[PDB]
Structure formats: C-alpha cells, structure tokens
Motif scaffolding. Structure first.
Motif, PDB file in Angstrom:
ATOM      1  N   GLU A  75       0.734  -1.206  -0.145  1.00  0.00           N
ATOM      2  CA  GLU A  75      -0.341   0.536   0.107  1.00  0.00           C
ATOM      3  C   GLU A  75       1.145   1.516   0.118  1.00  0.00           C
ATOM      4  OE1 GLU A  75      -3.490  -1.975   2.877  1.00  0.00           O
ATOM      5  OE2 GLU A  75      -3.590   0.002   2.889  1.00  0.00           O
ATOM      6  N   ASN A  76       0.427   1.921  -1.152  1.00  0.00           N
ATOM      7  CA  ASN A  76       1.287   3.766  -1.435  1.00  0.00           C
ATOM      8  C   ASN A  76       0.869   4.683  -1.133  1.00  0.00           C
ATOM      9  OD1 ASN A  76       3.098   6.031  -0.342  1.00  0.00           O
ATOM     10  ND2 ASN A  76       4.444   4.707  -2.140  1.00  0.00           N
ATOM     11  N   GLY A  77      -0.356   5.693  -0.713  1.00  0.00           N
ATOM     12  CA  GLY A  77      -0.658   6.701  -1.433  1.00  0.00           C
ATOM     13  C   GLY A  77      -2.590   6.262  -1.395  1.00  0.00           C
ATOM     14  N   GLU A  78      -2.255   5.247  -0.172  1.00  0.00           N
ATOM     15  CA  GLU A  78      -3.832   5.237  -0.129  1.00  0.00           C
ATOM     16  C   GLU A  78      -4.194   5.101   1.000  1.00  0.00           C
ATOM     17  OE1 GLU A  78      -4.610   0.928  -1.738  1.00  0.00           O
ATOM     18  OE2 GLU A  78      -3.777   1.463  -3.453  1.00  0.00           O
ATOM     19  N   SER A  79      -4.131   5.510   1.717  1.00  0.00           N
ATOM     20  CA  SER A  79      -4.317   5.891   3.383  1.00  0.00           C
ATOM     21  C   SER A  79      -3.519   6.662   3.846  1.00  0.00           C
ATOM     22  CB  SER A  79      -4.864   4.396   3.875  1.00  0.00           C
ATOM     23  OG  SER A  79      -4.991   4.464   5.835  1.00  0.00           O
ATOM     24  N   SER A  80      -4.109   6.625   5.389  1.00  0.00           N
ATOM     25  CA  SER A  80      -2.530   7.227   6.700  1.00  0.00           C
ATOM     26  C   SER A  80      -1.744   6.765   6.765  1.00  0.00           C
ATOM     27  CB  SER A  80      -3.832   7.553   7.468  1.00  0.00           C
ATOM     28  OG  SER A  80      -2.805   7.684   8.615  1.00  0.00           O
ATOM     29  N   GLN A  81      -1.734   4.998   5.703  1.00  0.00           N
ATOM     30  CA  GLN A  81      -0.077   4.220   6.108  1.00  0.00           C
ATOM     31  C   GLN A  81       0.450   3.933   5.271  1.00  0.00           C
ATOM     32  OE1 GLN A  81      -1.320   1.361   9.061  1.00  0.00           O
ATOM     33  NE2 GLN A  81      -3.073   1.062   8.594  1.00  0.00           N
ATOM     34  N   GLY A  82       2.065   4.096   4.695  1.00  0.00           N
ATOM     35  CA  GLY A  82       2.343   3.187   3.482  1.00  0.00           C
ATOM     36  C   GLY A  82       3.849   2.392   3.925  1.00  0.00           C
ATOM     37  N   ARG A  83       3.145   0.975   3.363  1.00  0.00           N
ATOM     38  CA  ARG A  83       3.668  -0.283   3.787  1.00  0.00           C
ATOM     39  C   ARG A  83       4.765  -1.265   2.273  1.00  0.00           C
ATOM     40  NH1 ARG A  83      -1.843  -2.646   5.396  1.00  0.00           N
ATOM     41  NH2 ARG A  83      -0.838  -5.203   5.572  1.00  0.00           N
ATOM     42  N   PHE A  84       5.811  -1.393   3.380  1.00  0.00           N
ATOM     43  CA  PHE A  84       6.603  -2.262   2.219  1.00  0.00           C
ATOM     44  C   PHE A  84       7.421  -3.145   2.985  1.00  0.00           C
ATOM     45  CE2 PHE A  84      10.604  -0.189   3.149  1.00  0.00           C
ATOM     46  CZ  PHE A  84      10.508   0.656   3.587  1.00  0.00           C
TER      47      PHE A  84
END
Ligand SMILES: *[C@@H]1O[C@H](CO)[C@@H](O[C@@H]2O[C@H](CO)[C@@H](O[C@@H]3O[C@H](CO[C@H]4O[C@H](CO)[C@@H](O)[C@H](O)[C@@H]4O)[C@@H](O)[C@H](O[C@H]4O[C@H](CO)[C@@H](O)[C@H](O)[C@@H]4O)[C@@H]3O)[C@H](O)[C@H]2NC(C)=O)[C@H](O)[C@H]1NC(C)=O
Ligand SMILES: *[C@@H]1O[C@H](CO)[C@@H](O[C@@H]2O[C@H](CO)[C@@H](O)[C@H](O)[C@H]2NC(C)=O)[C@H](O)[C@H]1NC(C)=O
Lengths: 141, 116
Positions: free
Chosen positions: A96-105
């Motif tokens: 997830e990146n750019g869709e919510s209040s948190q970016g994860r990788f």
C-alpha cells in the motif's frame, strides 16, 4: 469603522515510521538496536499521526537506506526512488502506498560492502489530496 | 500595541490575548467570537493570565477554510472582540492564519545490525 489586525504563524504535522515482524504488521519493534540475520525480511510501515486525516493521503516518494545516521550521506541504497518500487532487487514488494494514512512495504535484508556495520533507514513523504489529484502509483517496467 | 499570541499546533490552532485587555480601551468584560457563533472563548491561567479561543485545523469545525498551495496548506478564521453584546463604535477583529508544509522528512530512529 473597523480596525483590522493580520497575524501569521505555522506548524507541522507529526509523522512517524516503524518496523514490524509479521505478515500483517502485528508486532512493531520498540528496541533501540535490532540484530537479525540476512535471511530475515524487513517489514516497514509509516504513519501519519498529526491530523486532517480525512483529506490528505500519505504518499511515499523516496525511501532509501544509508550506512550512516546522518541523512545526507552520499552512499544510498534505494528502495523507492521516484514514487515507484525499485525493480532490480527481485524481493522488494510494496503493498500500500498513497491510499490511506499509512505506507507499507517489504524488502530483504542486506549489508553494505566495505568497512561498515550499521544500517539506517530514511524516507521522504508527500501529502497528496484525495479530492483534487490522483494519488495511487502507476508504475510499469 | 495589543500583544497577541498564536500556537499552530499539530491538531488545533489557538489565538490568545492577555489581561492587559482590562486596562486597554476599558474592556470590563471580554466577548470573543469566531466565524461560527457557537465557538466562544474561555479563560487561561497556566503561565500568565490569558483569554483564548480554540479551533481544530480542519475544514468547517468553526468555519475555518482551507486555502491550499502546491507547497503549503493554510487554514484561517477571523476573531471578533467587544466589551458589550452590541458594538456601537468599533468593529474590532483579528484575522489569523496558520500554514502547514506538505513535504516531510521522517527517519527511522532505530538502527540495524545484520549477520552475514
Ligand atoms: C504557497 O503558499 C504559501 C502559503 O501562503 C506561500 O508562503 C507564504 O508566502 C508569503 C508571500 O511571500 C509570505 O508572506 C510574507 O510577506 C511579507 C511581505 O508582505 C507584507 O508586507 C508588506 C510590507 O513589507 C505589505 O505591504 C504587504 O501588504 C504584506 O502585508 C514579508 O514581510 C514576510 O516575511 C516575514 O517572514 C517571517 C514570517 O514568519 C518573519 O521573519 C517576518 O514576519 C517577515 O516579515 C513574508 O514574506 C509567507 O511568510 C509565506 N509563508 C510561509 C513561507 O510559510 C508560498 O509563497 C506560496 N508559493 C508560491 C505562490 O509559489
Ligand atoms: C552530514 O555529513 C556531512 C559530510 O559527510 C557534514 O558536512 C557537510 O557536508 C556538506 C557537503 O556534503 C556541506 O555542504 C556542509 O557545509 C557540511 N556541513 C558541515 C557542518 O561541515 C554534515 O554536517 C553532516 N550533517 C549533520 C552533522 O547534520
């Protein structure tokens, strides 16, 4: 009549980053120095903690690791370079990146060649509007 | 010559004035209003004697608006002052704004140590 005063000021949104140790980021890490072999993965998430969470989406733009704590070291191993996953390492995976209040990788572990024993992580953050502009990454190739 | 203050906090904005208000211009009482009349002032005695209002930094709690640039994000509201319920000689107001940047530099504070 009217006597108008115009003042000004500024402030900042608080924003934080933390490591995790599960499939679905269950157990975040709290210790000050982490010892894990290069068979173990690095599941990392960011978080927007300040406010106005209804309007701004959190977009990761430049996430890199460097062998020194000072952020301006010339030696950088890049993970996200320009809003897109680095496709050279065949183990990087961004969920997830750019869709919510948190970016994860998620990447696999490394150690820099030469006389270095420490690894620090750094990221840059852009706050994209959910109502004005498309925020999800479009990347191919 | 009226010493204000501003505190553009992480979640909320705050405009406050001191109790030289009781000595300046004869303000026996203090009425303080925002653009929405339901938001009003209160008393603050934490460090000195202050009279303040509190607004969240979002779109439309107390009628604050978002004027946004490509590099900053600025909220604004307008405060009103009087010494009585009806104004007869001076429509005093204080316009404020707090700006917020959109480009952050966050770094993970903990370090690693791998074993090859
Ligand atoms: C994107 O949007 C952001 C958010 O607004 C903009 O950032 C602000 O830009 C403005 C414009 O430069 C900055 O405003 C201030 O303008 C003052 C000059 O104009 C006033 O003064 C003259 C007389 O000198 C009057 O005639 C006139 O009517 C105005 O009232 C400067 O004096 C300011 O300098 C101040 O800097 C700091 C403020 O904290 C202090 O040291 C002093 O008070 C000093 O006076 C300033 O230039 C405003 O500060 C900017 N906000 C920021 C940086 O957070 C961007 O410019 C905009 N980007 C674009 C359009 O590309
Ligand atoms: C980060 O490291 C650099 C050198 O590795 C420190 O020195 C700066 O180097 C840049 C060019 O790389 C110069 O433009 C600066 O003027 C240098 N600054 C100083 C104070 O010498 C830099 O200071 C370090 N950053 C810190 C300690 O925050």
């Amino acid at each position: 009549s009217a006597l108008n005063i115009r003042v000004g000021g500024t402030g900042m949104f608080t924003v934080r980053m933390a490591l995790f140790q599960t499939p679905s980021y269950t157990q975040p890490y709290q210790g000050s120095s982490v010892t894990l072999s290069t068979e173990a993965f690095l599941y990392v998430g960011t978080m927007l903690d300040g406010g106005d969470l209804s309007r701004f989406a959190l977009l990761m733009t430049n996430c890199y690791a460097t062998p020194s704590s000072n952020a301006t070291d010339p030696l950088k191993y890049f993970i996200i370079q320009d809003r897109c996953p680095h496709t050279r390492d065949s183990t990087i995976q961004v969920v997830e990146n750019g869709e919510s209040s948190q970016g994860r990788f998620s990447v696999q572990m490394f150690r820099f060649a030469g006389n270095y024993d420490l690894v620090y992580l750094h990221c840059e953050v852009y706050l994209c509007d959910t109502m004005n502009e498309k925020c999800k990454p479009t990347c191919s190739g």
